[PDB]
Write a protein that binds this ligand. Structure first.
Ligand SMILES: CCCCCCCCCCCCCCCCCC(=O)OC[C@H](COP(=O)(O)OCCN)OC(=O)CCCCCCCCCCCCCCCCC
Ligand SMILES: CCCCCCCCCCCCCCCCCC(=O)OC[C@H](COP(=O)(O)OCCN)OC(=O)CCCCCCCCCCCCCCCCC
Ligand SMILES: CCCCCCCCCCCCCCCCCC(=O)OC[C@H](COP(=O)(O)OCCN)OC(=O)CCCCCCCCCCCCCCCCC
Ligand SMILES: CCCCCCCCCCCCCCCCCC(=O)OC[C@H](COP(=O)(O)OCCN)OC(=O)CCCCCCCCCCCCCCCCC
Ligand SMILES: CCCCCCCCCCCCCCCCCCCC
Ligand SMILES: CCCCCCCCCCCCCCCCCCCC
Ligand code: SF4
Lengths: 60, 113, 150, 162, 323, 208
């Protein structure tokens, strides 16, 4: 193969290593479940309940 | 002398303790832990003829390893051999590289067809 | 306003991956246009067959409650016809061909997916290659097996 | 020094006896590797450090690797090999064994009738071997390179698949 | 029994035992550090819940692997199957056995040294070959064949890459190689030897981007697939101990070993070694995996003539400077 | 409060009986140490079935980091794996494959059904779907969802760890009792009924 191709590939490997090193010098993106509680939007579709009217009777 | 035989004893203890360490690792792994049976447990895991290029690669490794042993013998005695031995080793490496280039150009070292 | 990226004429793995990067950028442009220009109006059509009706009118109007009651229990009555819609999916062209017999259920639902075509195109394109070339080709198709089998 | 030599020689002899009387090719090659390690220990006991280093680097690290490679590609399941056991059949092996036996007694008679001042076990480094190799033995080096080249060309020409 | 000779014998034996235990502990804790440093490289934390900072994760994995059922297939050959992880561990451990970590702290001050390391690597390829043949699985068989031909293609020039340092120091001994770096480290003159030895040492350690079982997981053709319990654990521990061995040999052969201006020599040796272990993690986390034919073509057409030319130029420089 | 299971090769080929907990104080401490080591290093089998596997590998990524629990090694071989996550639908063509892979796993092994398909078949009450993976292999933890979010998979991992931490298995295969004793733990529904019924107000769905 070409010597120029070899040098360009070597430089690209060095660039990839450098970028992963700067990504090591970055901020952690992990949400620490369960110590950090998971935020959910108000219309999230999770556990199903039956609710009550403001008077206290069951709405169903 | 005392130092050389102490070094020999230390090396012997190193080899013996390493071999005994992996042997006791096997003994602990085999002896400990419960065992249970399944029907397809003994069947090899297969996710539920070999080419001659492997032989060619291993053969080239053998030949170039013998020429590597020649260069091993040369490299530890480079200064006492002088420029004459440098010329001999240059001829040796020239023959080595000519054989390597000949292997390259005829596709012997080309894995893909 | 968005552009459709095209290749040079040869469908390599790298060309397909770079094209999908380009459509990611164009989809970001479309998302920016959606963010800047979102109209103020209804989120549901005013047709009688809008299933379900708007929820508050269902909760305080008896005719809307009747429409919602019959649309979520028995189903909405599509008149007997055949319809077809093809869209540009994330992995190719995805189409629904729906035959209605006048009932509240589909008489025929035909789902055309592009992953079926790509998995069928595999033996014609990977023939004469390596196994690792097959792995790269599998990784560069953008399929899923639910799309193939469904 | 002598104790290691005798133990390694006994291990090499027993291992070679196990190679020449085995049916499994991989077991025979493993016992051959063990005998090569033992002969390397013999070489290290005699002060030929470079010779033992080359026995494990080249003989037990390249050539037996090539033999193991070939046995892998053959997939030798003992077809008409384990089902025959003709070498273990006595009237086949009595003859050649007694041939090698009388040859061994003649060679032992030759060996015992020579002067022996003993081997002092002085270590011969690889530097002296390299000095000799590129000194009084230069045509040996270049024509051994040509010999390896000849083996390369021959076995490439023979061992192709097409 | 009170004599200085017996005291020197026992202290030397104790030093060798301490070195061996520290190397095994460092290899296991470096499997854990592989996990932690991959987490650092990938914007996460990795295991940090089992003990303080995850420090007891290795003990939990060790207990699990000891008390996991150790099983040998019925179709498999017992001796070869039991022998392959032993080779994968012992070969690179005894390859470490020649590395000097401090002045006066060496196990075997051999006259061959890196030659002995070559013996241990040539024996270490048998672990992969025997794991492939012994398991009686054809997928593992071709996987071991591919990995073994790769390791041969890089072992063909591993020693020739070391021969430039050998020529510069003028001896096969490890301590003389370290002492020849007292003025200038060998990474500057033997830079091509340094990169070729890096590539070959990574390849013979079966590390990324030369790892075969992680290359093709869809085929399920790895040679580790039928190993479980403490045998697979021995494969992993031998792999990381080999990483430690290759890093320490790299430090002693190209980065001066223990030599340093201010810090104690073992501190410098540990710092340079741990830097090269971190570089192993970064190489695993950064580079993509090349193809098989590309990898062995890079081993044969490029690296071997580079090692030969490097040795020739090193010899020309050495005899040019010897007036 | 324990169940005793012994296996001897319809599936599953096991018989279970309710038994009193047997638990020297050194043997007990050894049992807790073995359970601690087993539960703090759980290697899941990397088995891809359907969209629930996409959520599982989402749990393995950086924003979630399942590696913190020591459950990240993700073996491609069932011999090296401790946990089988059925993350997807039990198709009839894939069910013998799942059974074969589960048979190729080694003791101790645990099973997590991930999603409604693996629980009971889910929405796919159809001709080509096995209605739940517990029809033919025993399941230790179930996750409702279609799909469960990645932290639901972590919550099931914690549930499995708590179940392992109080189960009894033989330390060696030559000494002791060789049956497997599993704890009959309190259901999470009855445990969380106190804090779930008392919920009064929730945020209205018109906001972020
Ligand atoms: C066995 C190996 C044999 C071959 C290697 C022999 C030893 C090294 C000899 C010198 C090598 C020099 C290589 C060429 C450097 C200049 C060109 C270059 O960087 O090319 C790579 C790439 C080209 O750009 P391109 O891929 O076209 O991307 C589009 C952007 N223009 O550009 C880029 O990616 C951007 C710039 C990247 C620069 C990277 C660093 C180059 C110098 C490295 C020196 C040594 C570093 C050692 C490691 C340090 C960090 C740990
Ligand atoms: C303790 C010891 C170890 C310590 C750790 C640090 C050192 C680790 C070294 C790792 C080396 C990995 C080498 C990988 C070589 C891969 C070569 C290869 O096959 O490349 C193929 C690729 C394309 O091949 P081609 O034939 O052109 O295909 C055309 C098809 N369209 O061709 C190309 O892409 C061309 C370029 C190929 C690669 C050139 C060499 C790069 C080596 C990696 C970068 C190292 C930089 C220094 C890092 C710090 C070292 C301390
Ligand atoms: C114990 C009973 C048998 C048990 C089963 C078999 C176990 C292995 C036995 C063989 C290997 C160990 C032999 C004993 C060596 C003990 C050390 C010794 O004798 O050292 C002497 C000498 C030291 O060097 P030198 O300079 O000559 O010493 C003179 C004093 N200044 O040393 C030398 O010069 C060289 C020393 C030998 C060479 C190095 C070691 C070679 C190992 C080869 C292993 C072969 C495979 C064995 C397989 C076993 C299972 C089948
Ligand atoms: C499953 C088990 C398989 C077999 C494993 C090994 C079996 C034997 C284990 C016990 C060995 C006991 C110790 C043997 C002697 C060690 C010391 C020694 O060899 O000293 C001699 C020499 C000294 O060198 P030096 O001092 O520099 O010389 C100047 C003059 N004194 O130093 C030398 O000559 C050094 C060179 C020889 C060192 C040999 C080391 C072992 C080689 C075999 C490795 C096997 C790897 C695993 C199996 C692979 C597959 C079969
Ligand atoms: C199908 C062909 C098989 C060929 C087998 C050949 C076996 C040869 C056995 C030779 C046995 C010699 C026994 C001793 C002879 C007398 C002493 C040596 C000559 C003086
Ligand atoms: C990755 C590093 C592996 C090292 C294995 C061997 C460890 C040997 C430790 C020796 C410690 C004492 C060294 C001599 C004293 C000088 C240094 C004193 C401060 C540590
Ligand atoms: S439960 Fe839902 S998300 Fe999970 S595999 Fe089934 S369809 Fe996919």
């Amino acid at each position: 193969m070409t010597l120029k191709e070899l040098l360009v590939g070597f430089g690209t490997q060095v660039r990839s290593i450098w970028m992963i090193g700067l990504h090591a010098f970055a901020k952690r993106e992990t949400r620490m479940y369960p110590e950090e509680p998971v935020y959910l939007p108000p219309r999230y579709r999770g556990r199903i309940v039956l609710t009550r009217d403001p008077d206290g009777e069951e709405r169903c | 002398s005392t130092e050389v035989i102490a070094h020999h004893w230390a090396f012997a203890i190193f080899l013996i303790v390493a071999i005994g360490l992996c042997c006791l690792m096997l003994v602990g792994g085999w002896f400990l832990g419960g065992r249970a049976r399944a029907r397809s447990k003994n069947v090899p895991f297969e996710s539920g003829r070999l080419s001659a290029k492997f032989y060619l690669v291993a053969m080239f490794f053998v030949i170039f390893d013998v020429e590597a042993l020649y260069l091993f013998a040369w490299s530890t005695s480079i200064r006492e051999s002088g420029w004459v031995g440098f010329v001999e080793a240059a001829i040796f490496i020239f023959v080595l590289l000519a054989g390597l280039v000949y292997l390259v150009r005829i596709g012997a070292l080309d894995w893909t067809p | 306003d968005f552009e459709i990226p095209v290749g040079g004429g040869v469908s390599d793995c790298y060309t397909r991956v770079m094209l999908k990067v380009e459509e990611l950028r164009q989809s970001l442009r479309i998302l920016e246009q959606c963010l800047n220009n979102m109209p103020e109006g209804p989120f549901k059509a005013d047709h009688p067959l809008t299933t379900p009706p708007p929820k508050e009118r269902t909760l305080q109007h008896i005719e809307t409650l009747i429409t919602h009651f019959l649309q979520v229990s028995w189903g909405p009555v599509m008149p007997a016809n055949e319809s077809f819609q093809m869209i540009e999916a994330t992995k190719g062209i995805n189409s629904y061909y729906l035959t209605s017999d006048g009932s509240t259920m589909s008489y025929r639902t035909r789902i055309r997916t592009p992953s079926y075509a790509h998995l069928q195109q595999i033996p014609a394109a990977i023939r004469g290659s390596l196994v690792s070339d097959l792995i790269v080709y599998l990784g560069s198709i953008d399929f899923v097996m639910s799309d193939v089998d469904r | 020094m002598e104790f290691a030599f005798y133990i390694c020689g006994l291990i090499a002899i027993l291992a070679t006896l196990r190679v020449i009387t085995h049916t499994n090719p991989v077991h025979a090659l493993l016992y051959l590797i063990i005998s090569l390690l033992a002969i390397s220990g013999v070489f290290f006991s005699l002060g030929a450090y470079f010779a033992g280093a080359l026995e494990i680097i080249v003989y037990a690290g390249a050539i037996m690797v090539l033999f193991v490679f070939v046995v892998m590609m053959l997939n030798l399941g003992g077809s008409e090999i384990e089902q025959e056991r003709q070498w273990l059949k006595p009237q086949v092996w009595i003859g050649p064994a007694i041939l090698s036996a009388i040859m061994l007694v003649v060679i032992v008679y030759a060996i015992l009738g020579v002067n022996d001042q003993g081997i002092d076990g002085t270590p011969i480094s690889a530097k002296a071997v390299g000095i000799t190799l590129f000194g009084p033995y230069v045509l040996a080096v270049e024509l051994a390179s040509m010999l390896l080249l000849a083996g390369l060309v021959v076995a490439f020409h023979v061992g192709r698949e097409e | 029994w009170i004599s200085p000779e017996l005291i020197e014998i026992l202290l030397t034996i104790l030093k060798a035992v301490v070195i061996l235990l520290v190397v095994v502990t460092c290899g296991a804790f470096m499997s854990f550090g592989e996990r932690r440093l991959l987490g650092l490289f990938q914007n996460r934390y990795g295991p940090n819940r089992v003990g303080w900072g995850g420090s007891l994760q290795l003990v939990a994995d060790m207990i699990k692997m000891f008390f996991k059922e150790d099983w040998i297939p019925k179709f498999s050959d017992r001796v070869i199957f039991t022998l392959a992880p032993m080779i994968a561990f012992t070969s690179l451990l005894l390859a470490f056995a020649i590395v000097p970590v401090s002045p006066g702290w060496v196990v075997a001050d051999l006259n061959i040294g890196i030659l002995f390391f070559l013996m241990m690597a040539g024996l270490a390829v048998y672990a992969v070959l025997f794991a492939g043949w012994s398991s009686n699985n054809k997928y593992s068989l071709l996987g071991a064949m591919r990995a073994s031909a790769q390791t041969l293609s890089y072992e063909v020039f591993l020693g020739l890459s070391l021969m430039g340092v050998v020529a510069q120091a003028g001896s096969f001994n490890m301590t003389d190689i370290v002492n020849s770096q007292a003025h200038v480290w060998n990474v500057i003159p033997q830079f091509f030897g340094f990169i070729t030895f890096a590539i070959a040492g990574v390849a013979v350690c079966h590390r990324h981007p030369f790892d075969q079982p992680e290359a093709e997981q869809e085929l399920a053709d790895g040679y580790h697939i039928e190993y479980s319990g403490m045998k697979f654990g021995l494969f992993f521990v031998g792999e990381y101990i080999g990483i430690v061995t290759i890093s320490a040999l790299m430090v002693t052969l190209f980065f001066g070993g223990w030599q340093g201006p201010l810090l104690p020599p073992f501190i410098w040796f540990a710092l340079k070694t741990a830097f090269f272990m971190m570089m192993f993690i970064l190489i695993r986390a950064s580079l993509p995996r090349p193809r098989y034919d590309q990898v062995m073509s890079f081993g044969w057409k490029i690296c071997l003539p580079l090692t030969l030319i490097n040795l020739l130029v090193t010899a020309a420089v050495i005899l040019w400077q010897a007036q | 409060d324990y169940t005793l299971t012994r296996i001897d090769p319809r599936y599953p080929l096991q018989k279970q009986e309710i038994v009193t907990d047997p638990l020297n104080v050194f043997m007990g401490k050894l049992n807790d140490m073995v359970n601690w080591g087993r539960k703090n290093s759980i290697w899941p089998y990397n088995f891809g079935l359907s969209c629930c596997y996409v959520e599982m590998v989402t749990s393995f990524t950086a924003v979630h980091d399942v590696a913190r629990f020591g459950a990240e090694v993700l073996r491609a071989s069932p011999r090296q794996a401790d946990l089988m996550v059925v993350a997807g639908t039990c198709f009839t063509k894939m069910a013998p494959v799942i059974q074969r892979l589960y048979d190729q796993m080694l003791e101790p092994k645990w099973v997590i059904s991930m999603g409604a398909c693996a629980n009971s078949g889910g929405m796919y009450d159809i001709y080509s779907v096995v209605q739940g993976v517990d029809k033919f292999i025993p399941v230790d933890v179930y996750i409702p969802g279609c799909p469960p979010r990645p932290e639901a998979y972590m919550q099931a991992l914690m549930l499995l760890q708590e179940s392992i931490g109080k189960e009894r298995r033989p330390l060696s295969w030559v000494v002791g009792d060789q049956g497997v004793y599993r704890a009959n733990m309190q259901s999470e529904r009855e445990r969380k009924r106190g804090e779930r019924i008392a919920v009064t107000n929730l945020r209205t769905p018109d906001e972020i």
